[PDB]
Amino acid sequence: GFARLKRSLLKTKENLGSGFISLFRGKKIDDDLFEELEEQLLIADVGVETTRKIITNLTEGASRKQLRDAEALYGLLKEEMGEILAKVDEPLNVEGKAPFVILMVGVNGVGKTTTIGKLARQFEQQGKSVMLAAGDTFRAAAVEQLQVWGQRNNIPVIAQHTGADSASVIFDAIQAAKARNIDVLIADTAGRLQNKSHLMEELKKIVRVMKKLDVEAPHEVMLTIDASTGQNAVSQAKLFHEAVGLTGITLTKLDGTAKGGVIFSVADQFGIPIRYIGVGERIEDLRPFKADDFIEALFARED
Template identity: 85%
Template sequence: MENVRLLGYDLNLAKLSFDRWECSCKWQKKKTGLLSWFSFGNQHQSKEQTAEPSQKIGVGDKKSTISTQDDEKTNSPIVADHEKLAESHTESAVATRLNETLEQKAKPIVENSNVQKQPNKENFFTRLKKSLLKTKQNIGFGLLNLFRGKKIDDDFFEQLEEKLLIADIGVETTHKIIKSLTEHANRKQLKDAEVLYEKLKETMAEILAKVDKPLETNGKNPCVILMVGVNGVGKTTTIGKLAYQFQAQGKSVMLAAGDTFRAAAVEQLQVWGERNNIPVIAQHTGADSASVIFDAFQAAKARNIDVLLADTAGRLQNKTDLMIELQKIVRVMKKIDEKAPHEIMLTLDASTGQNAVNQAKLFHEAVGLTGINLTKLDGSAKGGVIFAIADQFGIPIRYIGVGEAIEDLRLFKADDFIEALFARED
């Protein structure tokens, strides 16, 4: 019995010794960590680096941390190996994180650079084809489908006439096209309509070629461009875009806020001027439009400005008194320069179809138009009206609007327009 009691006492002593030893080990580990934290010595720092990666490489906690002070010398080569392995893993992890960070930062830059370069890659012809997509449904695709596999007879020409009228090409122009194709088919004794398709394209190209004349602004000092048109066609916006383009060509520009009936028009023009550092001559709302433009003309001559863009109030073509006022503006400008205005440009909205033809007729009769700007071709299926305007009046088409961006106001080029309109999709 006495032996059993002594044995229990010895076991308790052994357990107490083991607990003290374990606490000593834990304290030693904590002390090492604290010393490493405060950067006391390279030895403690290396031990901290060794302890952390050892968990990552699968070394057990007991094997890596439970050791006696007597075994520290024996285990030092192992610790050294662990330190080297830990350092290599740490360097690898840091390099990996650095690469990932650089990739994440570089990725948006690459994407942004692609977005910025994309508009340059997409040339004007591509954008023109996209903008004419609705008109192509009637003229390009629509006519091509009509010509495929058809025989040339009266029924064929009736269907062709209907297609051209739906495309807003107009009655007179449609009859001219039909007559030209009929004579060509009879002369060549054609039976297959597909052969006649190229003749249609050629005939329509000839109509537009007559009005493909770019605006000449050099040598006028200043070249005065009087902008006219009804409300809502994009006249004031077109002035801002033209001002930007002339300035990009190295020309000095001035704006005249001649639309004195609408305060918003004056403000809009002033915004364009401030944005592009272009002087704007304006007066109070309700002032005499001819007086504003007269003052602007004199100021432009005094400052040796290259181009003067003069806005006018939007007016309905059937309002006689407003048309008379427009004639007054022209007379006042001729007091300064007999040849002024050097350009009277009518802005038309392509989406109005045959109404645009009526506008061109009345404005031309009132002031004698010298140029036309056709806007909103991108949002309308009535782009065929350009053929009616070109055929009936022969007035040069200076610009076409194929979008809202500044660069979407483009010089009109008949060949590009025809190719985009009749382009066959694969």
């Protein structure tokens, strides 16, 4: 519930949300204050451009409202930062397709594989049938890990030999899922970053091949990024958004990091819906993102 969400964000709340209260207590609204607040936002990984927007809007709103007390900045900041997250607060709906195809993109080692498993279990718990495609075809250990997980959870995993063509594996998986009236297909992909131009090509190849079987596929292109990696997450988002058309973002490992500010940078810089946030180890701790619950937990205060 909500109480677990608050507890999971305590390290980010040191600096953001309720963490602002001690910064404002008894201060004057002046440049020294906005400079300290700028610094605190940047340290939290909110990012130069998004921080500049927040500070600018706050400065203007403070003047317009003729505020006297720095404590009164808290509500204006909660509105400003809430608005950033509200603009990307569109939940993923996987209903009504045969299969709904999720193309999972992102670097290796940011919770991409974990997210695939948790989403698969959530959809199954909802009464949907799920299939996986082991599209990261040149990493033999990762394929075998998806297969073993599929074998442990009674979920089919389509896979070919090491070095198979990723687009062919995923083509075969869509074909299989359509014939078995599978509700949701979740397709892994390679996450090696060196060749940006290569990445755009392998992903564009995957998408084109998909569309030979279903012009609507992929129905979702989901990036996974790790919030504890700070601005590396922002740069990955930039890379994959320019590389392929993203329609959804999952941000993992929000719990236990003081770098939870990166969600605001991702929301503001890209405007792509944030579908899920990972706030713990449990299957259900991959939460459908709710901007309002998120903001309330971050800004929760009991004074």
